[PDB]
mmCIF file of N, CA, C and O in Angstrom:
data_model
loop_
_atom_site.group_PDB
_atom_site.id
_atom_site.type_symbol
_atom_site.label_atom_id
_atom_site.label_comp_id
_atom_site.label_asym_id
_atom_site.label_seq_id
_atom_site.Cartn_x
_atom_site.Cartn_y
_atom_site.Cartn_z
ATOM 1 N N UNK A 1 63.268 -179.324 -145.452
ATOM 2 C CA UNK A 1 62.739 -178.997 -146.762
ATOM 3 C C UNK A 1 61.231 -179.140 -146.831
ATOM 4 O O UNK A 1 60.700 -180.247 -146.731
ATOM 5 N N UNK A 2 60.539 -178.019 -146.999
ATOM 6 C CA UNK A 2 59.082 -178.024 -147.080
ATOM 7 C C UNK A 2 58.592 -177.017 -148.116
ATOM 8 O O UNK A 2 58.102 -177.396 -149.179
ATOM 9 N N UNK A 3 58.729 -175.734 -147.798
ATOM 10 C CA UNK A 3 58.297 -174.673 -148.700
ATOM 11 C C UNK A 3 59.297 -174.487 -149.837
ATOM 12 O O UNK A 3 58.961 -173.943 -150.889
ATOM 13 N N UNK A 4 60.526 -174.941 -149.617
ATOM 14 C CA UNK A 4 61.576 -174.825 -150.622
ATOM 15 C C UNK A 4 61.851 -176.174 -151.279
ATOM 16 O O UNK A 4 62.703 -176.284 -152.162
ATOM 17 N N UNK A 5 61.127 -177.199 -150.842
ATOM 18 C CA UNK A 5 61.295 -178.540 -151.386
ATOM 19 C C UNK A 5 60.010 -179.020 -152.055
ATOM 20 O O UNK A 5 60.038 -179.892 -152.924
ATOM 21 N N UNK A 6 58.885 -178.445 -151.643
ATOM 22 C CA UNK A 6 57.590 -178.815 -152.199
ATOM 23 C C UNK A 6 57.115 -177.780 -153.214
ATOM 24 O O UNK A 6 56.214 -178.042 -154.010
ATOM 25 N N UNK A 7 57.731 -176.602 -153.179
ATOM 26 C CA UNK A 7 57.374 -175.527 -154.097
ATOM 27 C C UNK A 7 58.560 -175.137 -154.972
ATOM 28 O O UNK A 7 58.385 -174.599 -156.064
ATOM 29 N N UNK A 8 59.766 -175.411 -154.483
ATOM 30 C CA UNK A 8 60.981 -175.085 -155.222
ATOM 31 C C UNK A 8 61.569 -176.331 -155.878
ATOM 32 O O UNK A 8 62.458 -176.239 -156.725
ATOM 33 N N UNK A 9 61.068 -177.496 -155.478
ATOM 34 C CA UNK A 9 61.544 -178.760 -156.026
ATOM 35 C C UNK A 9 60.384 -179.587 -156.572
ATOM 36 O O UNK A 9 60.527 -180.783 -156.830
ATOM 37 N N UNK A 10 59.235 -178.943 -156.746
ATOM 38 C CA UNK A 10 58.049 -179.619 -157.259
ATOM 39 C C UNK A 10 57.428 -178.831 -158.409
ATOM 40 O O UNK A 10 57.045 -179.402 -159.430
ATOM 41 N N UNK A 11 57.335 -177.516 -158.236
ATOM 42 C CA UNK A 11 56.764 -176.650 -159.261
ATOM 43 C C UNK A 11 57.673 -176.581 -160.483
ATOM 44 O O UNK A 11 57.289 -176.947 -161.594
ATOM 45 N N UNK A 12 58.909 -176.101 -160.277
ATOM 46 C CA UNK A 12 59.898 -175.974 -161.350
ATOM 47 C C UNK A 12 60.400 -177.328 -161.841
ATOM 48 O O UNK A 12 61.124 -177.411 -162.833
ATOM 49 N N UNK A 13 60.010 -178.387 -161.139
ATOM 50 C CA UNK A 13 60.420 -179.737 -161.503
ATOM 51 C C UNK A 13 59.320 -180.458 -162.274
ATOM 52 O O UNK A 13 59.560 -181.011 -163.348
ATOM 53 N N UNK A 14 58.112 -180.447 -161.721
ATOM 54 C CA UNK A 14 56.973 -181.098 -162.359
ATOM 55 C C UNK A 14 56.362 -180.200 -163.430
ATOM 56 O O UNK A 14 55.731 -180.682 -164.370
ATOM 57 N N UNK A 15 56.555 -178.894 -163.279
ATOM 58 C CA UNK A 15 56.024 -177.929 -164.235
ATOM 59 C C UNK A 15 57.114 -176.970 -164.703
ATOM 60 O O UNK A 15 56.901 -175.760 -164.776
ATOM 61 N N UNK A 16 58.283 -177.519 -165.020
ATOM 62 C CA UNK A 16 59.389 -176.697 -165.475
ATOM 63 C C UNK A 16 60.515 -177.519 -166.070
ATOM 64 O O UNK A 16 61.177 -177.087 -167.015
ATOM 65 N N UNK A 17 60.735 -178.707 -165.517
ATOM 66 C CA UNK A 17 61.790 -179.592 -165.999
ATOM 67 C C UNK A 17 61.305 -180.425 -167.180
ATOM 68 O O UNK A 17 62.062 -181.212 -167.750
ATOM 69 N N UNK A 18 60.040 -180.246 -167.545
ATOM 70 C CA UNK A 18 59.454 -180.979 -168.662
ATOM 71 C C UNK A 18 58.222 -180.260 -169.199
ATOM 72 O O UNK A 18 57.341 -180.878 -169.796
ATOM 73 N N UNK A 19 58.169 -178.949 -168.986
ATOM 74 C CA UNK A 19 57.047 -178.143 -169.453
ATOM 75 C C UNK A 19 57.179 -177.839 -170.942
ATOM 76 O O UNK A 19 58.278 -177.774 -171.492
ATOM 77 N N UNK A 20 56.032 -177.649 -171.611
ATOM 78 C CA UNK A 20 55.993 -177.349 -173.046
ATOM 79 C C UNK A 20 56.522 -175.955 -173.361
ATOM 80 O O UNK A 20 56.683 -175.590 -174.526
ATOM 81 N N UNK A 21 56.792 -175.178 -172.316
ATOM 82 C CA UNK A 21 57.304 -173.824 -172.484
ATOM 83 C C UNK A 21 58.593 -173.628 -171.691
ATOM 84 O O UNK A 21 59.480 -172.880 -172.102
ATOM 85 N N UNK A 22 58.688 -174.305 -170.551
ATOM 86 C CA UNK A 22 59.866 -174.202 -169.697
ATOM 87 C C UNK A 22 60.950 -175.178 -170.146
ATOM 88 O O UNK A 22 62.122 -174.818 -170.245
ATOM 89 N N UNK A 23 60.548 -176.415 -170.418
ATOM 90 C CA UNK A 23 61.483 -177.443 -170.858
ATOM 91 C C UNK A 23 61.777 -177.316 -172.349
ATOM 92 O O UNK A 23 62.872 -177.645 -172.806
ATOM 93 N N UNK A 24 60.792 -176.839 -173.103
ATOM 94 C CA UNK A 24 60.946 -176.669 -174.544
ATOM 95 C C UNK A 24 61.818 -175.457 -174.858
ATOM 96 O O UNK A 24 62.583 -175.463 -175.822
ATOM 97 N N UNK A 25 61.695 -174.418 -174.039
ATOM 98 C CA UNK A 25 62.471 -173.198 -174.231
ATOM 99 C C UNK A 25 63.942 -173.430 -173.897
ATOM 100 O O UNK A 25 64.832 -172.930 -174.586
ATOM 101 N N UNK A 26 64.189 -174.190 -172.837
ATOM 102 C CA UNK A 26 65.552 -174.488 -172.411
ATOM 103 C C UNK A 26 66.155 -175.603 -173.260
ATOM 104 O O UNK A 26 67.372 -175.786 -173.288
ATOM 105 N N UNK A 27 65.296 -176.345 -173.951
ATOM 106 C CA UNK A 27 65.744 -177.439 -174.804
ATOM 107 C C UNK A 27 65.997 -176.956 -176.228
ATOM 108 O O UNK A 27 67.046 -177.233 -176.811
ATOM 109 N N UNK A 28 65.030 -176.233 -176.784
ATOM 110 C CA UNK A 28 65.148 -175.714 -178.142
ATOM 111 C C UNK A 28 66.439 -174.923 -178.317
ATOM 112 O O UNK A 28 67.056 -174.950 -179.382
ATOM 113 N N UNK A 29 66.843 -174.219 -177.264
ATOM 114 C CA UNK A 29 68.061 -173.418 -177.302
ATOM 115 C C UNK A 29 69.292 -174.307 -177.463
ATOM 116 O O UNK A 29 70.234 -173.958 -178.174
ATOM 117 N N UNK A 30 69.275 -175.458 -176.799
ATOM 118 C CA UNK A 30 70.389 -176.396 -176.867
ATOM 119 C C UNK A 30 70.298 -177.258 -178.123
ATOM 120 O O UNK A 30 71.306 -177.762 -178.619
ATOM 121 N N UNK A 31 69.082 -177.422 -178.633
ATOM 122 C CA UNK A 31 68.858 -178.223 -179.831
ATOM 123 C C UNK A 31 69.202 -177.438 -181.091
ATOM 124 O O UNK A 31 69.819 -177.967 -182.015
ATOM 125 N N UNK A 32 68.800 -176.171 -181.121
ATOM 126 C CA UNK A 32 69.064 -175.313 -182.270
ATOM 127 C C UNK A 32 70.204 -174.342 -181.971
ATOM 128 O O UNK A 32 70.267 -173.248 -182.534
ATOM 129 N N UNK A 33 71.102 -174.751 -181.082
ATOM 130 C CA UNK A 33 72.240 -173.918 -180.708
ATOM 131 C C UNK A 33 73.260 -173.848 -181.841
ATOM 132 O O UNK A 33 74.209 -173.068 -181.788
ATOM 133 N N UNK A 34 73.053 -174.667 -182.868
ATOM 134 C CA UNK A 34 73.959 -174.679 -184.001
ATOM 135 C C UNK A 34 73.420 -175.484 -185.167
ATOM 136 O O UNK A 34 74.167 -175.854 -186.072
#
């Protein structure tokens, strides 16, 4: 794991699993799902 662990497990993780647009978009959907 290098290019798929440092770019596929770091970018979408550090800048996607808690991003104001990536994490908020995937969260708001579950928060306002009903």
